[PDB]
A paper describes a structure:
The HIV-1 capsid is a fullerene cone made up of hexamers and pentamers of the CA protein. In the fullerene cone HIV-1 capsid, the central channels of the hexameric and pentameric capsomers each contain a ring of arginine (Arg18) residues that perform essential roles in capsid assembly and function. The ability of the HIV-1 CA protein to generate two different capsomers is controlled by a molecular switch—a Thr-Val-Gly-Gly (TVGG) motif—that adopts two distinct conformations which dictate whether a CA subunit will form a hexamer or pentamer. Here, we show that these Arg18 mutant CLPs contain a non-canonical pentamer conformation and distinct lattice characteristics that do not follow the fullerene geometry of retroviral capsids.
Author numbering:
A (entry chain A), B (entry chain A), C (entry chain A), D (entry chain A), E (entry chain A), F (entry chain A): 1 to 2, 12 to 84, 96 to 221
The structure:
């Protein structure tokens, strides 16, 4: 990235993460950490290298096409949608644009589109919905909380709904004894206080 | 590549990929990502190192000979076919040509020929044809789509035929229940909509 | 860190340590050794990458919110709490602040907050309390001391209480024979003297 | 090589290749790719490090002696055979010669001699001769071609004989059905055409 | 060390050595080879990272306290004991002292103290004393010598006592036949002569 | 070496080779390839790190003492034996001597002494003598030659004796059939000719 060719120690890491972690919600920060300040011709190389999950990678290409069309409708030379995707642009043109004054972050825009696509694909790949997660009969409370939040991390929503869900839904799905202990704890109890009060059981 | 010798951490990676991934359609982007801005005398070293699959590597040499003959018929000194292949050229001559003003991308041309050869060899190595891929009796729809597109990726064709194949052939090979659900969904349904509507079954 | 992107050889190491060592008390120095002189936008990348233990990572985010609120109440432009956390700041603004004269160590402050959060989370994750650790019937004294101190390392307290605990509590929980040998050794005996006197048994 | 000492990441790779791949015909390009622009005092270090196969490495030393004697008979100071082999020369003398104007490629000459020796040793290590390779009763044609060419790669001969062997001998050793299909295909059929016509069986 | 942060490829190596080799007498040279010209704030990071063996690492801290107290009693600004240990000093102060003219080797002093502590801890961790090592009934003489010297390496003593022990004690503990052969060899026999004379048995 | 500290990627390689390869005759070139242009204070670090084989490493120290005494008897300031060994010299003095004009290769001398010691130790560690190596009843001739030369490599002797041994002793120990075939081949037969004539059996 920003010129020098992308090192094989990065492509192998990206391929290995996608192969092993599947599309768990932690793939998105890994993608944004591996490719920093990269031209679109590097994200394309980073995306085509993924061996399996071609059906879920075409869906990411559909999303790229939609965003490119929206930018093209909205709008050196003018950067159009097919130029942001890096499929109708030369390496010299992109590097000159990224080093121009003022610079146009074509790579940054493509990275943002990929992040949107990855958010949507991971959202679909979530196994089950939050309302289906229920506390087990004999299960440590730390395990239950660390499963509930892992499920909630995949879904994305506005802070008002999520804040309501974390505060109230969590205490609703507990077993009778844990529900009584949470109720006895009372309102305004932070997560640490809830877990440390109910850690004995 | 562009002068410095190619690092062993790249030859080992290229050999290991070809040995393990065989000629799955993801080998082509890996080849184009490992060797960037490389002289033809580096692609030759990257090709001879492949241990097995010598029959499919001679076919890549036949394709190189055909393309070299076509360029020689079409046409410092003049770059002929035997000079593009790097077998009748000196390292000093190639480096001088690649640093000359204007530069002649002899390495780029050889890389393009190898990409054409790799496309043809992978096309032959595809196990079965698209029309043979049929949905199973009890099989998740995501699995079926991610097998159908993996098979379709190997074949290369014009966008008009492929667009027709992806839109219509996919809905033709489904089982009666999935075919009914797809038909009830109606025209203009994108891939994400099809999969999310039929994900319940 | 301090500009250049964080190498993947560091993110993989941090993820692997947290995955394997869990939250044993040695994670805190590992975290402070991996990220030196790093902008807050690097600690965020280092924290989001952790796959599991999301419940214990949200608690670290609650602690970050509390510390950010306290700083905001206490107080280029003024660095507020949401700016220290790196969620409402640009990379250019942070780098300029960290290279400004005089420099404001926003990254250092965030690192200190994370260290406080990590201390609290590890303190909670300690399996059992010191008073529950008792010497076994037939157990080497070195093993007993190296289990007692490992348990005591997780708990953090003022030096006066800890000095009292190490000097007196250690000799209180021994078996009758080891208690007699420690008493025969007498006051002012350092740890090495205690272990080398009682190493025979 | 060209001054800096040879990195251990190269000696380990060379030792591991020779240990694992034995003397398969792909060792020669690996040797020519690992040591580029290297002084003779580096090839000697790269040759002595090989643990096993000392009998086949002495034969490479016999070949070096023969070539050195021929050069000595044929012919700063004059580079003689014992000087090309690097056993009677100082590092300063070799580096000065390799940086002199005009430079004498003593390292290149030694590398060429080693390549000749390696060609001869691999030729001897070939398991069986081409005429012994016969198509099996029930064997895929791709497997047969990829075994026939692997055997033919070890033997080295003039292009006229090899071209005759590849065109005619290949179609002679086939089974009756494959021989009939090849004959029905007719003259001028390239390797790809032969394999794709007979791939069905 | 001497400014740049310590690479993770060194902390992992140090942790892995201490975890695997335990406190065998070869840990001391490994510690002195990993950290060269390092500030005290790097040795502290290298010491806290050790996961297990906390009891034997507190003893190393007791030794550090003793040496720091002795230096403080013995004695920019004056470097006191709590300043040598790096717990009451800033990174800027230490770097300035280590780059000052004349430079004060605070890091070197801390390294020497750690070496003294490591010598003492390894001395305690030695399994058995030299006088307990006896030659077996049917045991190769090379094995016996290579066990005797490994035990003697852990103990540290003045050269006069050790020279007496190596010359005389070694020949005292042999079996009757080996004792007769050693006696027949006579005085002034070096170790190589003893082993090569008695290697037949 | 020549100033910068020795990388841990070299110490680990040296320790791993000595641990695995034991003292096979290929350890000597590995030692001379790992440490090039190194000060004596680096060879000492490279020697002390070896975990096992302390008996055979003390013998290398005895040899160092003998060579140091001989140099001291034979003879900035004068480099004496205890100064060549690096045990009574400062790093500044050695670096200044190695960068002085004219430079004194104290490191080179120590390296040569270690090579002499390693030759002697490997010579002792050879399992059996050449005269004990006999051809088996049913054994491939290549295997026999590659065992005979491996044994002969450990022993070091003048070229006149070794040339006599390779030419005549090799043909003396063969079985009757191979002895007849070698005799029928006649005088002046090189190793390759002998092996290729007798390779059929």
């Amino acid at each position: 990235p920003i010129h020098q060719a992308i090192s094989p120690l990065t492509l192998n890491a990206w391929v290995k993460v996608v192969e092993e972690k599947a599309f768990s919600p932690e793939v998105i920060p890994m993608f944004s950490a591996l490719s920093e300040g990269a031209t679109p011709q590097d994200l394309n190389t980073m995306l085509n290298t993924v061996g399996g999950h071609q059906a879920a990678m075409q869906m990411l290409k559909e999303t790229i096409n939609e965003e490119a069309a929206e930018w093209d409708r909205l709008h050196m030379r003018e950067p159009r949608g097919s130029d942001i995707a890096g499929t109708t642009s030369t390496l010299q043109e992109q590097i000159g644009w990224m080093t121009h004054n003022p610079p146009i972050p074509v790579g940054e825009i493509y990275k943002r589109w990929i992040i949107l696509g990855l958010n949507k694909i991971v959202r679909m790949y979530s196994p089950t919905s939050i309302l289906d997660i229920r506390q087990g009969p004999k299960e440590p409370f730390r395990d239950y909380v660390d499963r509930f939040y892992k499920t909630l991390r995949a879904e994305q929503a506005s802070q008002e709904v999520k804040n309501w869900m974390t505060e109230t839904l969590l205490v609703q799905n507990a077993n009778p004894d844990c529900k009584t202990i949470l109720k006895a704890l009372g309102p305004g109890a932070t997560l640490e206080e809830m877990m440390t009060a109910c850690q004995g059981v």
